[PDB]
Amino acid sequence: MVPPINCIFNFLQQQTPVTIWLFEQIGIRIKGKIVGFDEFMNVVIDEAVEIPVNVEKGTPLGKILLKGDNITLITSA
Amino acid sequence: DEDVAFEYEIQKNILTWKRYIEYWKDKQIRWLYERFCSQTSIWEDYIRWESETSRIFWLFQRCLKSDCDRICLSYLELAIEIRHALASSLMKMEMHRKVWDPVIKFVEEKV
Amino acid sequence: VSTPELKKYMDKKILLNINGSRKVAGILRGYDIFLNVVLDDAMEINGEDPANNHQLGLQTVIRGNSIISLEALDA
Amino acid sequence: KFTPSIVIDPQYYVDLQLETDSESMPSSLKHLTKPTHILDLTNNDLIMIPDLSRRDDIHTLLLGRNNIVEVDGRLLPMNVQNLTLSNNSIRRFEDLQRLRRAPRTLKNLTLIGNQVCHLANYREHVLRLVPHLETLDFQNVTAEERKSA
Amino acid sequence: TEAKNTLYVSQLNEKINMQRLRVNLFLLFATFGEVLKVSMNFKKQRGQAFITMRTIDQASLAQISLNGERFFGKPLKVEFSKSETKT
Amino acid sequence: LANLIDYKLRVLTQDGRVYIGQLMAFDKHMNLVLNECIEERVPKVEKRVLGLTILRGEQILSTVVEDKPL
Amino acid sequence: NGIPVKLLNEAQGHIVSLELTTGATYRGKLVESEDSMNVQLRDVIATEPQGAVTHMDQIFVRGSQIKFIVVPDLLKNAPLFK
Amino acid sequence: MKLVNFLKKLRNEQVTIELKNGTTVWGTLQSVSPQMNAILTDVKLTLPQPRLIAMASLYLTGGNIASLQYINIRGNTIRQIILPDSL
Amino acid sequence: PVNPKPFLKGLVNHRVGVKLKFNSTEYRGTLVSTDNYFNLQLNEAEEFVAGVSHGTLGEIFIRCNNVLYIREL
Amino acid sequence: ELEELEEFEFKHGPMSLINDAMVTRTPVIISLRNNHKIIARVKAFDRHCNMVLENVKELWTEKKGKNVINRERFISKLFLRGDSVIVVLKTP
RNA sequence: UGUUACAAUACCAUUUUUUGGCAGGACGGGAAGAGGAGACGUCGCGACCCUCGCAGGUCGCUUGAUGUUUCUUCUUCCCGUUC
């Protein structure tokens, strides 16, 4: 019963580690902690770690503003 | 040649004039259309095709021989590109108070 | 913008297919004018034959530019 | 003889209604509109059909009831999947011995009411050199029949 | 009855593809003028059909002509239809 | 294009498929509606008849005019 | 308004076919059409681009993944001839 | 200002439009839309070099160089239109 | 709660990295200016092709249409 | 005063290199989405980065069954949709 | 006074238009011999079948057509085009 802009911000208050999927690029995923966003879902993320989908490694990228037009699917852990 | 068949078509409602001229259109087209004409809209078309100065003048003259008001505009334009021409136009096809006035205003300007 | 009427699909187990030929089942919590769909009970259906239970109660959300379509599993 | 004024002024969707205008030889088929699927040259005084180059659009070439004596072998139209030639002045096989190089998308070919049609050994010789067509003179063709050619 | 634009078609051979049967009743009746509309149903109007010609008089030729010709294995009948074909 | 109403339009979509149909109407987004539309993929070969279809202006690459009306 | 969207709004209660931009075709009964070309589709029979055919109860495809819909042919008589 | 209005100066101008699928259009603009949708005339389009999808589109038209009397192109598909060198 | 326009205008004059949407190309440089619509302007741009450097380029502009993300190094 | 807030954010925003290349008449190199690197001068800038160029020297890459060759052409006048634009890079 | 047409004025953020994009000799067809094949569907040529009237389902194909998806040519004759 929650519209999605009120369901982004509960990642932000509770500060959950969040897995985010890209858009028409299935080999790589990004995982991190949501630190900021906007009305067009352009997301600034903390502790950003790449996930090669094809053992899942990581390259620590830390602070990333991920532009929302490649954002697909927002989860957590 | 393509002109033999065309000729046959011609000689045997402006469809032969269209098929000969508009298919070619350039020189060939000119040859055709003009010929057809000699054998208002048609005149206009011919003029367009032509579009040298002398030729244009000739065309205008031809048109004048036998939308008079409409033509008069054309005459005026020709003159611009005069007074004599305007006079000629007036004498053949005597609506033309505002055009006459305009013409005069050139004289006035000159003065 | 008109509201996309998915009120029939509220609290319903739906099946979102996603660009890159991804398929994600879940239960709808919310939507918006951009059709950004919130799913309770996230179930990632991957390729061969696992079924990745992704977010069981943590109400995932999918951006509307990546949603291909949706099948309500129930009526 | 087939004025290009005549060729334009009968098109409807089911073709070119060009039927009862009795002409002699095609000179201006240059003037076809180009989305033509049917050429309706029936009830015409045709003795031949020349002047059809690579017009890959016609499906049904009507030539029925035409004083026609000859069907030819390099006369193009590439997708004639229907073709009538009935009710004409054709009278001998080797008039139409040039139906070998008719294209391979040829399926309906009618020759009823002609002088060629009443000959014995009929369906063998026309399925000969036209081996793949479907219906012949409003008659379906089986493949067991096609072992004749 | 009347004698109008729509020539009544009957007793066709039912073993034919209906899209093949419209075409083969187009190319057959194209010798008697332009065939404008052939309406036809396999929803139990099967065996019978409607063919509407352009000219009134061109329908009068083929009905005298083709009433009794074999066509895919059956000698068909051609009549004048009771009512002018709609649409 | 309002000039081009009620003509047959050979309209080329994004994936190389070509539609041929009578233009019923268009709009701001070039959303087209096509009476007795036919769909062909590989280019006469490989054609499918659709009928009265819509065509969204997102997918059109170009549209050209096929033929005159009745 | 948009005449195609106005056309699609009259197509409610009718059986359509929806081919999608990945290629799959959705034949079903159009009951609810949205102004942004979003369509709720009942009793849908669905066909993959490779040819896998399934039937589904309810499908709802977004606007910007639709190639084209095919409305039934009764609509082209009125009120969109003007 | 708005360079969409810059293209509205290009009426009857003999340009070469290049499209996103590699289609090279060569012809004269009659008009252009405020969403850059370009109608053209007396235009033959080439699909330069390669000969290696789009190509199907060129063959879709009476078109590899195919010329069509009237062509309307969606403005979102244009990559770049080359204008006459005398301008 | 660093919102993106507060995030990025504060990130001006920092050697930031930008990955494109193609992943064939990245750019490392100092972000000079950024509008509301997230066009980027980088100075002393080094091009990173597939994660390895392509070369030094200079004052560069990146369209909004290709910015996959942007990172601070 | 709508336009002044539009044009001064235009002035020292990310549209500076498209505004500076034209004023100083210095060629900027433009790499497009299909790898058509375009080095050219700028005549005008738009909101969408629509660009009208002069003395365009488009360079692209053609791949075959041996060493890749370089294909380049000179275009005197060019109008360019901003959609293909990835990178505007000014060379000194 | 009304109707129609074309321009001016009023307008890059996910569903539309400001891109998720890119990477004698040649040719064709048919047949024979020696070292293209299997799936999923989608429309056709025959019928022992079904069905019976005015408002296409099933089975063969005895070498019917056609899109995904995996794997790995030479000789001889006949018919057309070109020099």
PDB file of C-alpha atoms in Angstrom, chain D:
ATOM      1  CA  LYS D   1      -3.383   1.752 -80.482  1.00  0.00           C
ATOM      2  CA  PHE D   2      -3.390   1.995 -76.710  1.00  0.00           C
ATOM      3  CA  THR D   3      -3.206   5.688 -75.819  1.00  0.00           C
ATOM      4  CA  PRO D   4      -1.544   6.518 -72.471  1.00  0.00           C
ATOM      5  CA  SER D   5      -4.639   8.604 -71.703  1.00  0.00           C
ATOM      6  CA  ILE D   6      -6.602   5.354 -71.611  1.00  0.00           C
ATOM      7  CA  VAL D   7      -4.367   3.470 -69.184  1.00  0.00           C
ATOM      8  CA  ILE D   8      -5.040   5.653 -66.148  1.00  0.00           C
ATOM      9  CA  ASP D   9      -8.556   6.949 -66.032  1.00  0.00           C
ATOM     10  CA  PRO D  10      -9.974   2.460 -63.383  1.00  0.00           C
ATOM     11  CA  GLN D  11      -8.375   1.207 -60.167  1.00  0.00           C
ATOM     12  CA  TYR D  12     -10.122  -0.495 -57.248  1.00  0.00           C
ATOM     13  CA  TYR D  13      -9.143  -2.889 -54.455  1.00  0.00           C
ATOM     14  CA  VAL D  14     -10.313  -6.509 -54.452  1.00  0.00           C
ATOM     15  CA  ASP D  15      -6.263  -4.068 -59.935  1.00  0.00           C
ATOM     16  CA  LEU D  16      -6.690  -2.109 -63.165  1.00  0.00           C
ATOM     17  CA  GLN D  17     -10.077  -2.294 -64.829  1.00  0.00           C
ATOM     18  CA  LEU D  18      -8.859  -2.016 -68.409  1.00  0.00           C
ATOM     19  CA  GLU D  19     -11.334  -4.433 -69.881  1.00  0.00           C
ATOM     20  CA  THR D  20     -13.522  -3.444 -72.779  1.00  0.00           C
ATOM     21  CA  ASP D  21     -11.127  -1.035 -74.484  1.00  0.00           C
ATOM     22  CA  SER D  22     -10.224  -2.847 -77.695  1.00  0.00           C
ATOM     23  CA  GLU D  23      -6.547  -2.150 -78.331  1.00  0.00           C
ATOM     24  CA  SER D  24      -3.824  -3.590 -80.559  1.00  0.00           C
ATOM     25  CA  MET D  25      -0.326  -3.590 -79.065  1.00  0.00           C
ATOM     26  CA  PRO D  26       1.033  -2.389 -75.715  1.00  0.00           C
ATOM     27  CA  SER D  27       3.221   0.647 -76.182  1.00  0.00           C
ATOM     28  CA  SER D  28       2.646   2.746 -73.060  1.00  0.00           C
ATOM     29  CA  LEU D  29       2.518   0.424 -70.089  1.00  0.00           C
ATOM     30  CA  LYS D  30       5.124   2.817 -68.726  1.00  0.00           C
ATOM     31  CA  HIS D  31       2.140   4.620 -67.209  1.00  0.00           C
ATOM     32  CA  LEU D  32       1.025   1.929 -64.781  1.00  0.00           C
ATOM     33  CA  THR D  33       0.469   3.318 -61.285  1.00  0.00           C
ATOM     34  CA  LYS D  34       2.753   0.671 -59.645  1.00  0.00           C
ATOM     35  CA  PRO D  35       0.807  -0.879 -56.754  1.00  0.00           C
ATOM     36  CA  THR D  36      -0.984  -3.057 -59.344  1.00  0.00           C
ATOM     37  CA  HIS D  37      -1.825  -6.624 -58.423  1.00  0.00           C
ATOM     38  CA  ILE D  38      -4.087  -7.362 -61.365  1.00  0.00           C
ATOM     39  CA  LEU D  39      -3.757  -6.440 -65.041  1.00  0.00           C
ATOM     40  CA  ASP D  40      -7.271  -6.787 -66.455  1.00  0.00           C
ATOM     41  CA  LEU D  41      -6.692  -7.115 -70.202  1.00  0.00           C
ATOM     42  CA  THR D  42      -9.756  -9.180 -71.080  1.00  0.00           C
ATOM     43  CA  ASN D  43     -12.294  -8.399 -73.848  1.00  0.00           C
ATOM     44  CA  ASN D  44      -9.502  -6.658 -75.748  1.00  0.00           C
ATOM     45  CA  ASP D  45      -8.392  -7.089 -79.353  1.00  0.00           C
ATOM     46  CA  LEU D  46      -4.927  -8.319 -78.351  1.00  0.00           C
ATOM     47  CA  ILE D  47      -2.953 -10.486 -80.722  1.00  0.00           C
ATOM     48  CA  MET D  48       0.149 -10.537 -78.495  1.00  0.00           C
ATOM     49  CA  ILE D  49       1.330  -9.359 -75.131  1.00  0.00           C
ATOM     50  CA  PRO D  50       4.692  -7.583 -75.459  1.00  0.00           C
ATOM     51  CA  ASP D  51       6.024  -4.637 -73.466  1.00  0.00           C
ATOM     52  CA  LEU D  52       6.042  -6.109 -69.955  1.00  0.00           C
ATOM     53  CA  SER D  53       9.542  -5.797 -68.515  1.00  0.00           C
ATOM     54  CA  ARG D  54      10.489  -6.309 -64.874  1.00  0.00           C
ATOM     55  CA  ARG D  55       7.120  -5.417 -63.331  1.00  0.00           C
ATOM     56  CA  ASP D  56       7.386  -7.637 -60.279  1.00  0.00           C
ATOM     57  CA  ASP D  57       4.024  -6.653 -58.835  1.00  0.00           C
ATOM     58  CA  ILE D  58       1.219  -8.303 -60.820  1.00  0.00           C
ATOM     59  CA  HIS D  59      -0.389 -11.452 -59.454  1.00  0.00           C
ATOM     60  CA  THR D  60      -3.260 -11.994 -61.856  1.00  0.00           C
ATOM     61  CA  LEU D  61      -2.747 -11.174 -65.513  1.00  0.00           C
ATOM     62  CA  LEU D  62      -6.142 -11.315 -67.187  1.00  0.00           C
ATOM     63  CA  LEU D  63      -5.842 -12.085 -70.902  1.00  0.00           C
ATOM     64  CA  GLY D  64      -9.012 -14.092 -71.346  1.00  0.00           C
ATOM     65  CA  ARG D  65     -11.345 -13.553 -74.306  1.00  0.00           C
ATOM     66  CA  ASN D  66      -8.599 -11.939 -76.369  1.00  0.00           C
ATOM     67  CA  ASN D  67      -8.126 -12.571 -80.087  1.00  0.00           C
ATOM     68  CA  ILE D  68      -4.768 -13.749 -78.718  1.00  0.00           C
ATOM     69  CA  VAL D  69      -2.750 -16.286 -80.712  1.00  0.00           C
ATOM     70  CA  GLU D  70       0.535 -16.499 -78.816  1.00  0.00           C
ATOM     71  CA  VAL D  71       1.908 -16.735 -75.289  1.00  0.00           C
ATOM     72  CA  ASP D  72       5.634 -16.118 -75.101  1.00  0.00           C
ATOM     73  CA  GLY D  73       8.694 -17.269 -73.157  1.00  0.00           C
ATOM     74  CA  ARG D  74      10.826 -14.309 -72.145  1.00  0.00           C
ATOM     75  CA  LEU D  75       7.799 -12.133 -71.342  1.00  0.00           C
ATOM     76  CA  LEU D  76       8.544 -11.289 -67.803  1.00  0.00           C
ATOM     77  CA  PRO D  77       6.133 -10.510 -65.046  1.00  0.00           C
ATOM     78  CA  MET D  78       7.824 -12.134 -62.175  1.00  0.00           C
ATOM     79  CA  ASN D  79       5.072 -13.144 -59.753  1.00  0.00           C
ATOM     80  CA  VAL D  80       2.213 -14.204 -62.013  1.00  0.00           C
ATOM     81  CA  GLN D  81       0.534 -16.641 -59.671  1.00  0.00           C
ATOM     82  CA  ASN D  82      -2.671 -16.385 -61.685  1.00  0.00           C
ATOM     83  CA  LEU D  83      -2.874 -16.098 -65.468  1.00  0.00           C
ATOM     84  CA  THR D  84      -5.870 -16.613 -67.728  1.00  0.00           C
ATOM     85  CA  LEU D  85      -5.570 -17.152 -71.486  1.00  0.00           C
ATOM     86  CA  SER D  86      -8.963 -18.646 -72.240  1.00  0.00           C
ATOM     87  CA  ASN D  87     -11.377 -17.912 -75.104  1.00  0.00           C
ATOM     88  CA  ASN D  88      -8.739 -16.826 -77.620  1.00  0.00           C
ATOM     89  CA  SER D  89      -7.473 -17.504 -81.148  1.00  0.00           C
ATOM     90  CA  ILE D  90      -4.632 -19.832 -80.144  1.00  0.00           C
ATOM     91  CA  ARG D  91      -4.786 -23.123 -82.065  1.00  0.00           C
ATOM     92  CA  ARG D  92      -1.490 -25.090 -81.949  1.00  0.00           C
ATOM     93  CA  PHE D  93       0.878 -26.502 -79.290  1.00  0.00           C
ATOM     94  CA  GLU D  94       4.052 -24.952 -80.611  1.00  0.00           C
ATOM     95  CA  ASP D  95       2.457 -21.580 -80.223  1.00  0.00           C
ATOM     96  CA  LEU D  96       2.882 -22.290 -76.520  1.00  0.00           C
ATOM     97  CA  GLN D  97       6.058 -24.391 -76.612  1.00  0.00           C
ATOM     98  CA  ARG D  98       7.573 -21.252 -75.106  1.00  0.00           C
ATOM     99  CA  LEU D  99       5.786 -21.837 -71.824  1.00  0.00           C
ATOM    100  CA  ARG D 100       8.966 -23.492 -70.558  1.00  0.00           C
ATOM    101  CA  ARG D 101      10.624 -20.258 -69.479  1.00  0.00           C
ATOM    102  CA  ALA D 102       7.478 -18.953 -67.781  1.00  0.00           C
ATOM    103  CA  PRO D 103       8.467 -18.139 -64.161  1.00  0.00           C
ATOM    104  CA  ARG D 104       8.385 -20.660 -61.335  1.00  0.00           C
ATOM    105  CA  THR D 105       5.666 -18.895 -59.353  1.00  0.00           C
ATOM    106  CA  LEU D 106       3.053 -19.748 -61.988  1.00  0.00           C
ATOM    107  CA  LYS D 107       0.124 -21.692 -60.530  1.00  0.00           C
ATOM    108  CA  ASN D 108      -3.204 -20.992 -62.291  1.00  0.00           C
ATOM    109  CA  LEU D 109      -3.250 -21.190 -66.080  1.00  0.00           C
ATOM    110  CA  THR D 110      -6.545 -21.488 -67.926  1.00  0.00           C
ATOM    111  CA  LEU D 111      -6.983 -22.262 -71.610  1.00  0.00           C
ATOM    112  CA  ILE D 112     -10.687 -23.236 -71.835  1.00  0.00           C
ATOM    113  CA  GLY D 113     -12.840 -22.445 -74.865  1.00  0.00           C
ATOM    114  CA  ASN D 114      -9.827 -22.271 -77.174  1.00  0.00           C
ATOM    115  CA  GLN D 115      -8.743 -24.225 -80.209  1.00  0.00           C
ATOM    116  CA  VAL D 116      -5.679 -25.639 -78.417  1.00  0.00           C
ATOM    117  CA  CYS D 117      -7.812 -27.159 -75.723  1.00  0.00           C
ATOM    118  CA  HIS D 118      -9.776 -29.848 -77.568  1.00  0.00           C
ATOM    119  CA  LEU D 119      -6.655 -31.766 -78.601  1.00  0.00           C
ATOM    120  CA  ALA D 120      -5.872 -35.229 -77.320  1.00  0.00           C
ATOM    121  CA  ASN D 121      -2.763 -35.720 -75.149  1.00  0.00           C
ATOM    122  CA  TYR D 122      -3.832 -32.414 -73.610  1.00  0.00           C
ATOM    123  CA  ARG D 123      -2.893 -32.245 -69.939  1.00  0.00           C
ATOM    124  CA  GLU D 124       0.364 -34.122 -70.489  1.00  0.00           C
ATOM    125  CA  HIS D 125       1.819 -31.596 -72.915  1.00  0.00           C
ATOM    126  CA  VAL D 126       0.892 -28.483 -70.948  1.00  0.00           C
ATOM    127  CA  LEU D 127       2.059 -29.939 -67.621  1.00  0.00           C
ATOM    128  CA  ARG D 128       5.098 -30.694 -69.707  1.00  0.00           C
ATOM    129  CA  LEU D 129       7.290 -27.555 -69.545  1.00  0.00           C
ATOM    130  CA  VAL D 130       4.931 -26.058 -66.940  1.00  0.00           C
ATOM    131  CA  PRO D 131       5.531 -28.754 -64.302  1.00  0.00           C
ATOM    132  CA  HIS D 132       4.689 -27.065 -61.028  1.00  0.00           C
ATOM    133  CA  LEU D 133       1.367 -25.269 -61.439  1.00  0.00           C
ATOM    134  CA  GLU D 134      -1.589 -25.961 -59.170  1.00  0.00           C
ATOM    135  CA  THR D 135      -4.833 -25.673 -61.151  1.00  0.00           C
ATOM    136  CA  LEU D 136      -5.192 -26.228 -64.886  1.00  0.00           C
ATOM    137  CA  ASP D 137      -8.338 -25.123 -66.751  1.00  0.00           C
ATOM    138  CA  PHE D 138     -10.127 -24.969 -63.413  1.00  0.00           C
ATOM    139  CA  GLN D 139      -8.823 -28.457 -62.594  1.00  0.00           C
ATOM    140  CA  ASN D 140      -6.595 -29.323 -59.609  1.00  0.00           C
ATOM    141  CA  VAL D 141      -3.395 -31.261 -60.294  1.00  0.00           C
ATOM    142  CA  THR D 142      -2.091 -34.173 -58.223  1.00  0.00           C
ATOM    143  CA  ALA D 143       1.580 -35.102 -57.939  1.00  0.00           C
ATOM    144  CA  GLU D 144       0.882 -38.654 -59.123  1.00  0.00           C
ATOM    145  CA  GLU D 145      -0.299 -36.947 -62.299  1.00  0.00           C
ATOM    146  CA  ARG D 146       2.967 -34.991 -62.203  1.00  0.00           C
ATOM    147  CA  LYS D 147       4.932 -38.182 -62.808  1.00  0.00           C
ATOM    148  CA  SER D 148       3.892 -37.654 -66.417  1.00  0.00           C
ATOM    149  CA  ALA D 149       6.357 -34.764 -66.390  1.00  0.00           C
TER     150      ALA D 149
END
